[PDB]
From a paper:
As the major determinant of the host specificity, the SARS-CoV-2 spike glycoprotein contains S1 and S2 subunits responsible for receptor recognition and membrane fusion, similar to other coronaviruses such as SARS-CoV and the Middle East Respiratory Syndrome Coronavirus (MERS-CoV). The RBD can adopt two different conformations: the “up” conformation, which is receptor-accessible, and the “down” conformation, which is shielded from receptor binding.
To understand the structural basis of the neutralizing mechanism for RmAb 1H1, we determined cryo-electron microscopy (cryo-EM) structures of the prefusion BA.1 spike trimer in complex with 1H1 using the six proline-stabilized (HexaPro) Omicron BA.1 spike ECD and the 1H1 Fab fragment. 3D classification revealed two classes of BA.1 spike-1H1 Fab complexes in which each RBD was bound with one 1H1 Fab, representing a 3-Fab-per-trimer binding mode. In the class I complex, the BA.1 spike trimer is in the semi-open form with all three RBDs adopting a semi-up position with a tilt angle of ~70 degrees, preserving a 3-fold symmetric conformation. In class I, three 1H1 Fabs coordinate to stabilize all three RBDs in the semi-up conformation through RBD-RBD interactions.
Residue numbers in the entry:
A (entry chain E): 1 to 122
B (entry chain D), G (entry chain H): 1 to 111
C (entry chain A): 350 to 596
D (entry chain C): 15 to 68, 77 to 142, 153 to 176, 185 to 210, 215 to 247, 257 to 349
E (entry chain C): 498 to 547
F (entry chain C): 399 to 448
The structure:
C-alpha cells in the first residue's frame, strides 16, 4: 500500500492551497489515524494537524497552526488539508503519514508517503 | 505542554565506533517514545517504537535505552550507511504541543 | 507500570463526586481513612501515581502484599495512607492488533523498597556465564509486554490504576474537600468544622495572644480550646454549650 | 578554593551552658500551665564548646549527632551561615545556608566544598567549586563591646530540618529565653557533620572580634512554665540533680519543706555472662544446604 | 520454565523443626561461653535462660 | 529438604492448603521451627529439561 | 558415604513368570536411581532412570517401583532375551563413595 500526496506547486504569498493525500491499495479504516506533517528544506520534522478516520474524528492541531490550517476527510480514500495566508516561512516538504493506534493523537508513524514539495515565492 | 530537545546536534566517529544520542523530555512520558531515521531526499523510517522494541526489517545494531525522562539511542556498529538524521517523538500527550518531534541530529560517518 | 508517573497535588480543592463519570466501574477500596467522610477533611500533601496493570494483578496494589507487581514494579509502604482507585479500561486500552506498548518488569535482583522506580534495562543474568549483551538461554530481557486477552475474563483486561497518597494533618492545609465555607456565627450553639477539626460549642471573640506560628489552643485535658480560623486569621474560643442535670 | 593556614592552632575552650537552649516543642498555645514534655533538649549546665575568632581562625568540622545548639556573641555579624552534610563533597548530598547582604539562600545541592570555606562591602564568594544536582531551594528575608546574641537550634528528625532562632541584645550570659521555631524544611538527607561560614574582612584579611558556642542535644524530660501570655518563662530539667527531680515529680516549681519519695535506684549490671554446654562440634549444615542434589 | 517468572523456577526448600526447651540442651547457638564471674551484678544466660 | 516451584513456596506453612500441602508435605498446625527457601535456577535447571 | 546392595544374587523362572530384583541403600537417596542392563560381551544399556521412567526404545515390560531406600524392579514377562545382569546406581552423592553401582544380579531364563 502507498500513500502518495498531490496538490503541490508554486503559490504566491497571502494565498490558499489545498493538499490532497490519497491512499493506494487500501481504504481509510476506523482503527488507524491519518495524520499530517511537514518538513522545512533544511530543518527537522514538525507536526501540523491530525485527524481520525473513525466514526467521530478526534481532530487535533499544533499550537503554531491553531487556526491557520484545517484538516478534513472527503471520501473513503482521500484526506485533505488546506491552509490560508501562506507566509514566506511556510515553504516546506509535506509528508502525509499514517498512524498505528487510535489514541486521539499521532502515535508512531508506521506508514509514510513519498512527500510533496510546496514552495512560496513572488 | 511537553517539549523535548535532542542532543548532540552532530556526531562523528570512525566506522568501528559507537554513537550515542540523548533525547530528554520536559515532563515524564514514561515509555511512549519513537526513534525515526530520515535519509536525505527520503521520507523518515521508524526504527525504535516503545523506546526498546526494534522495528520490522531493521538490523540488530540500534539499541534504545532509558525510560521516563532521559532516553538514549546507541549504535553498536556503523557501516557508512547509518549516516542520516534521527528524531525522537513523544507520542504521549499531543493535546496542546507545538511539535511532537525533537530537533535534528545528523550523524557523519567518516569512512 | 514499571515507569509509573508521579504527580504533585497542592494549592487546590479536591472534589470526589466528579470521579464517577471520568472513571466508570471504579473501586475505591483503600486504607488509612474512612472514604465516607473524605469531603470534610484537609490534606497537606497529595501524590498521584498512575499506571496500567492486568485485572488479576489489581489485588497486588495494597500494603503488605507480595507478587510480581509488588516486588519488581510498585511497592507500597506497610504504613500506607491514602486511597487507591482502579477501573476497567477495556474500551480505551485494547487494540485488535494487540496492545504491545505496556511493559512490566519481570526479572530483578532484589525486591523494591517502598516508593521506588526502576527504569534500568540492563540484561538479566539468570545463570552462571555472563550474558555480555546476548539474550540467549539464561539471559533474559527484564521487561515483558502485556498481551491482553479480552476474550477471557476480566482478569486478562487492562485496568487503569491511580494511587493517591495523603498525609492527613489539620493546620497547614493546602488541599481540602469540596465543601463550601459558611460564614461564622458567634455566641450560638453550633457544630463547626475548622480544617477538618469538627467540634460543637459556642465561638466567642478571644483575647488570647497566639504567637504568629501557633495555630491551636489546648486546655489541661489536651482538648482544643482556642482556635484560629483559616480565613481572616482571627482568634476564637471554643466553649461547650450549656448543660446540666435535671431534678 | 583558596588554601588558608593563618589560623592559630589551639584546642577549643569550654564553658557552662547555664539554662540556655529551650524551644517551643510544638505549635499549640498554652497559658498559665506547667507542662511536662519529653524531647531533644540541651541539658542544663553542660559543656558547650567555645570558639574565638579575631590571628585566630576557628572554622573546624564538628559532628552533628542528634542535634546542635548554635549560639553566637556578635558585633558586625561576621558569621554568614552554615554548611551541612556527611562528606561535604560530590559523593553525598549536602545542605547550604548563607545570609548575604540581601536575603537568605538555602540550597540542597551536590556541592564540591572547598577545604577551607569562608567569605570575604562583600564581593568574594569562595565556598564551593561546583554544584550539579540541586534538589531544593528557598528564599526569604535575611535571618539577621559585644551587643548581639544569636541563638540557633538545628534538628533533623523524620526527614525534616527544623530551625529555631532568637535574637537578643546584650561567656554565655545568665538568663532564660525560649526559642521560637523559624522554618521547617522537608529535605530528608543524611547529616552527620557541619561547618560554619565567616566573613573575613580585607584591609591581607583581618577578622573582627566574634565568638560562637556549639552544644549537643540529648533526649530528656523537661518541665516548662507558661505565663498568662503563652510565653515560656522558666523550665526545670527532671534529671539534673535530686532537687530538680523532686520538683518534676510534684509538677511544681516550689517544693515545700518535708520528705518526698521521688524515684528508685538500681545497680545496673556491667558484664554479660553466657554458659552453654560443653559442645564444640559444628552442626552438619553445609552438608544439608550445600548438597549437590536435593530430594524430590 | 525459567523463561517465565520466578514462579516457574526451582526453589530449594529446607525446613527445620526445633523444640524450644532449656535443660538437656543438645543443639545450641553459636555464641561462645564465658568465664564464671561471681558476686556482682551480671547479666546471665544459662542454656537460653536470660 | 526438597525442591519445589516458586509459586508453591507459600504452601509450606501451617494451616495452608494446596497440591503440595495435601499430597506431598503436610505441616502440623502447632508447628515450631523455621523454614528456609532460596532460588536455585543456577543449580537445578537444564537446557534439555529438568 | 552411601553404599548399595543388590539382592538376590541369582534368579530363575519359566518364560511365563515374573522376576523381581531388590536394590536397597544405606541412606535415603530419594528418587535418584538407574537400572543398567549389560549382555555378556556388550556394554551396559540404560533401562530405568529416575527409578520410574522407561528409557528410550525399551519395551514396556520392565517396571520400576519404590522410592527412598528400597527399590524393586519387576519384569512382567520374560522372552529368553532378558537373561542378563542388572545393576542399580545411586547417582545421588558421589563425593566420597567407593562404587556408585551395586552388585551383580544375573537372570537365567530356562526356556
Ligand atoms: C480571602 O479571604 C477573605 C477573608 O475575609 C475574603 O474577604 C476574600 O474574599 C478571600 N479571597 C478570595 C479570592 O476568595
Ligand atoms: C567540661 O568542662 C570543664 C571546664 O569547664 C573541663 O575541665 C572538663 O574536662 C570538661 N569535661 C569534658 C568531658 O570535656
Ligand atoms: C546515613 O549515613 C550513615 C553512615 O554515613 C548510615 O549508617 C545510615 O544508614 C544513613 N541513613 C540513611 C537514611 O541513609
Ligand atoms: C502579658 O502582656 C501584657 C501586655 O498586654 C503585659 O502587660 C504583661 O506584663 C504580660 N505578662 C507578663 C507576665 O509579663
Amino acid at each position: 500500500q502507498s500513500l502518495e500526496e498531490s496538490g503541490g506547486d508554486l503559490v504566491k504569498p497571502g494565498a490558499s492551497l489545498t493538499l490532497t493525500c490519497t491512499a493506494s491499495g487500501f481504504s481509510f479504516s476506523s482503527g488507524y489515524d491519518m495524520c499530517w506533517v511537514r518538513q522545512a528544506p533544511g530543518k527537522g520534522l514538525e507536526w501540523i494537524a491530525c485527524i481520525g478516520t473513525g466514526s467521530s474524528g478526534n481532530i487535533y492541531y499544533a499550537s503554531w497552526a491553531k487556526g491557520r490550517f484545517t484538516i478534513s476527510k472527503t471520501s473513503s480514500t482521500t484526506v485533505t488539508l488546506q491552509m490560508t495566508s501562506l507566509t514566506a516561512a511556510d515553504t516546506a516538504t509535506y509528508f502525509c503519514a499514517r498512524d498505528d493506534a487510535d489514541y486521539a493523537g499521532p502515535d508512531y508513524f508506521n506508514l509514510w508517503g513519498p512527500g510533496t514539495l510546496v514552495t512560496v515565492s513572488s | 505542554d511537553i517539549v523535548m530537545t535532542q542532543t548532540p546536534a552532530s556526531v562523528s566517529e570512525p566506522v568501528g565506533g559507537t554513537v550515542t544520542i540523548k533525547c530528554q523530555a520536559s515532563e515524564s512520558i514514561s515509555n511512549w517514545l519513537a526513534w525515526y531515521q530520515q535519509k536525505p531526499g527520503q521520507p523518515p523510517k521508524l526504527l525504535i517504537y516503545a523506546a526498546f522494541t526494534l522495528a520490522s526489517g531493521v538490523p540488530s545494531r540500534f539499541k534504545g535505552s532509558g525510560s521516563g525522562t532521559q532516553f538514549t539511542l546507541t549504535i553498536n556498529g556503523v557501516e557508512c550507511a547509518d549516516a542520516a538524521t534521527y528524531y525522537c517523538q513523544q507520542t504521549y500527550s499531543s493535546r496542546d504541543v507545538d511539535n511532537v518531534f525533537g530537533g535534528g541530529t545528523e550523524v557523519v560517518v567518516k569512512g | 507500570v514499571y515507569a509509573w508517573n508521579r504527580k504533585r497535588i497542592s494549592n487546590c480543592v479536591a472534589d470526589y463526586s466528579v470521579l464517577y463519570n471520568l472513571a466508570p466501574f471504579f473501586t475505591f477500596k483503600c486504607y488509612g481513612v474512612s472514604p465516607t467522610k473524605l469531603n470534610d477533611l484537609c490534606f497537606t500533601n497529595v501524590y498521584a501515581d498512575s499506571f496500567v496493570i492486568r485485572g488479576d494483578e489489581v489485588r497486588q496494589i495494597a500494603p503488605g502484599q507480595t507478587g510480581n507487581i509488588a516486588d519488581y514494579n510498585y511497592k507500597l509502604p506497610d504504613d500506607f495512607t491514602g486511597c487507591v482507585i482502579a477501573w476497567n479500561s477495556n474500551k480505551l486500552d485494547s487494540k485488535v492488533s494487540g496492545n504491545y506498548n505496556y511493559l512490566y518488569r519481570l526479572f530483578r535482583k532484589s525486591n523494591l523498597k517502598p516508593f521506588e522506580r526502576d527504569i534500568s534495562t540492563e540484561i538479566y543474568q539468570a545463570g552462571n556465564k555472563p550474558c555480555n549483551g546476548v539474550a540467549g538461554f539464561n539471559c533474559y530481557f527484564p521487561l515483558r509486554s502485556y498481551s491482553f486477552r479480552p476474550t477471557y475474563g476480566v482478569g486478562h483486561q487492562p485496568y487503569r490504576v491511580v494511587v493517591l497518597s495523603f498525609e492527613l494533618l489539620h493546620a497547614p492545609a493546602t488541599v481540602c474537600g469540596p465543601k463550601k465555607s459558611t460564614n461564622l456565627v458567634k455566641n450560638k450553639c453550633v457544630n463547626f468544622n475548622f480544617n477538618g477539626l469538627k467540634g460543637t460549642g459556642v465561638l466567642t471573640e478571644s483575647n488570647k495572644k497566639f504567637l504568629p506560628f501557633q495555630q491551636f489552643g489546648r486546655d489541661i485535658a489536651d482538648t482544643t480550646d482556642a482556635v484560629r480560623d483559616p480565613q481572616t486569621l482571627e482568634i476564637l474560643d471554643i466553649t461547650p454549650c450549656s448543660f446540666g442535670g435535671v431534678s | 578554593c583558596v588554601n588558608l593556614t593563618t589560623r592559630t592552632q589551639l584546642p577549643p575552650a569550654y564553658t557552662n551552658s547555664f539554662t540556655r537552649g529551650v524551644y517551643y516543642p510544638d505549635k499549640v498555645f498554652r497559658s498559665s500551665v506547667l507542662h511536662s514534655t519529653q524531647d531533644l533538649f540541651l541539658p542544663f549546665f553542660s559543656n558547650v564548646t567555645w570558639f574565638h575568632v579575631i590571628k585566630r581562625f576557628d572554622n573546624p568540622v564538628l559532628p552533628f549527632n542528634d542535634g546542635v545548639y548554635f549560639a553566637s556573641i556578635e558585633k558586625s555579624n561576621i558569621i554568614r551561615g552554615w554548611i551541612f552534610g556527611t562528606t561535604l563533597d560530590s559523593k553525598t548530598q549536602s545542605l547550604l545556608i548563607v545570609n548575604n547582604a540581601t536575603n537568605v539562600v538555602i540550597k540542597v545541592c551536590e556541592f564540591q566544598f572547598c577545604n577551607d570555606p569562608f567569605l570575604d562591602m562583600e564581593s568574594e564568594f569562595r565556598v564551593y567549586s561546583s554544584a550539579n544536582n540541586c534538589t531544593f531551594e528557598y528564599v526569604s528575608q535575611p535571618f539577621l563591646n559585644f551587643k548581639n546574641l544569636r541563638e540557633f537550634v538545628f534538628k533533623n528528625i523524620d526527614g525534616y530540618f527544623k530551625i529555631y532562632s532568637k535574637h537578643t541584645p546584650i561567656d554565655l550570659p545568665q538568663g532564660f529565653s525560649a526559642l521560637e521555631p523559624l522554618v521547617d524544611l522537608p529535605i530528608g538527607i543524611n547529616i552527620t557533620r557541619f561547618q560554619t561560614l565567616l566573613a573575613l574582612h580585607r584591609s591581607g584579611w583581618t577578622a573582627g572580634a566574634a565568638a560562637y558556642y556549639v552544644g549537643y542535644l540529648q533526649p530528656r524530660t523537661f518541665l516548662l512554665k507558661y505565663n498568662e501570655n503563652g510565653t515560656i518563662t522558666d523550665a526545670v530539667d527532671c534529671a539534673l540533680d535530686p532537687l530538680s527531680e523532686t520538683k518534676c515529680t510534684l509538677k511544681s516549681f516550689t517544693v515545700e519543706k518535708g520528705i518526698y519519695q521521688t524515684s528508685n535506684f538500681r545497680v545496673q549490671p556491667t558484664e554479660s555472662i553466657v554458659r552453654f554446654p560443653n559442645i564444640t562440634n559444628l552442626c552438619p549444615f553445609d552438608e544439608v544446604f550445600n548438597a549437590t542434589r536435593f530430594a524430590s
